[PDB]
Symmetry: D2
Subunit: 122 residues, 4 copies
Amino acid sequence: AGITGTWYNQLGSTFIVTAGADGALTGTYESAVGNAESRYVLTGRYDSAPATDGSGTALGWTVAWKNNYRNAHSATTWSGQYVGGAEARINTQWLLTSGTTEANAWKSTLVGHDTFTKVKPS
Amino acid sequence: AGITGTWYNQLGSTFIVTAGADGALTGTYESAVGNAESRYVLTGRYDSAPATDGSGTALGWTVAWKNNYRNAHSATTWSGQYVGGAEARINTQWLLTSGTTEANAWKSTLVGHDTFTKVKPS
Amino acid sequence: AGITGTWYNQLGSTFIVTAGADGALTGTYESAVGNAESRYVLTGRYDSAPATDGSGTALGWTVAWKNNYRNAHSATTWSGQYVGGAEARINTQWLLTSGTTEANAWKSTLVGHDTFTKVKPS
Amino acid sequence: AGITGTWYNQLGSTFIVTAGADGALTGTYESAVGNAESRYVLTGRYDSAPATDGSGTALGWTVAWKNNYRNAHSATTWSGQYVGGAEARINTQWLLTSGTTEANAWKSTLVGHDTFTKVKPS
Ligand SMILES: COC(=O)c1cccc(-c2cc3c(=O)[nH]ccc3o2)c1
Ligand SMILES: COC(=O)c1cccc(-c2cc3c(=O)[nH]ccc3o2)c1
Ligand SMILES: COC(=O)c1cccc(-c2cc3c(=O)[nH]ccc3o2)c1
């Protein structure tokens, strides 16, 4: 129900996460897009004692897009909240920074928004 | 990698990180004051095999603003790049999401930027 | 070409825009559908010679949240693209900056996304 | 109000703006060679009656990157605040959306931050 489980964004990427009792997020991410193949390590944190007033649960995680197969020389962070609901979801915005020369730094960082559910889109 | 150690942002904050051999970032984020109550766990990832063309090293990390003392029901992610050389820096953009109700989700996420140096501001 | 007219977001706001031949966007943003004291000037720019390759038409606009009735001492910019066809959309990300003191400048800017359609909901 | 004038960002782009009595911003933005080919129309909005408590003045503007010479099929919005006096600055964050196909929309938008002053960067 909660955060631990297998989630998918609107692009069909797969987010496999475990929420630890200590506030840790660990798991793997597999992207449906970009210069990516197979699973990447993720790590992050979440509020392990959220408000009880109907607010969502704040969280964030990072993937650096290097694994044993490929290296895109970039990293994404997702910042968002888990929303317990009929259909649970994690609503995020993200920042994807590529390593760049200093002259190209102004154009280093993409921004977007991903919504995760436990079902893959159709 | 150049990353392990203590970094300071432009507003006082301090973080101490270990860059592990296969891409992990682990450490703590705190205030200039350095009191324990201001200290929070951080975890993230970085490119452990960056390009050799003078490009920066992509990284990101998360802090959930809960520790043993306090809970802001929110998390920050920093996404950016480490720029080495004579005056090394970590240049970041960040997203701070607070847990909200759905009606308030429009006011859930702050955005900004932080630059970290190895020496304290001023 | 397809932009001019009335758009609805997913949360109860409207706007009416004219896309001029010179790349101008002008109109009115009504934050609460039906409420006249909730109408604000919008101004922006769009690509007046977009590609005809399946790509969206890039655009942006600003609303400063002051009118004759109210003033939130803030302004939103929406940056995005218009997607035509039978189910036309304007997909945006936005930045909402409030005037703050320097001390509070870290908390000045909210980020989010909205999607506008031509049907109120269809 | 303090806003009308010639501003420069940290990259040396030149923002020539007029703040009209009604909340309008109008002018030109150029990236920096002084050349016509590099100059683009901007429009935006600002809070024409800011708070009197020390807070900055909220504002935003858009440039679509089409002129008589070039067309990048993209647009940037800047959202920020003017901070008056000894000396004046406009602090912004920006969103740069390029037209994309639907499949590529996740990579449509860059994010960054620009600070403008009435002097060139040194
Ligand atoms: C510089 O390298 C890239 O641009 C890159 C490489 C591999 C994957 C991705 C990727 C996947 C993904 C996603 O599922 N949601 C949000 C961002 C996002 O980004 C990006
Ligand atoms: C609702 O806010 C909080 O719970 C809280 C508490 C303590 C620190 C912060 C904080 C520090 C910091 C930083 O150095 N750069 C970027 C964002 C950011 O946020 C936020
Ligand atoms: C696709 O992009 C372009 O074709 C293009 C052309 C000329 C200038 C720019 C430009 C200048 C500038 C700046 O000063 N601050 C923030 C963003 C930004 O973008 C972009």
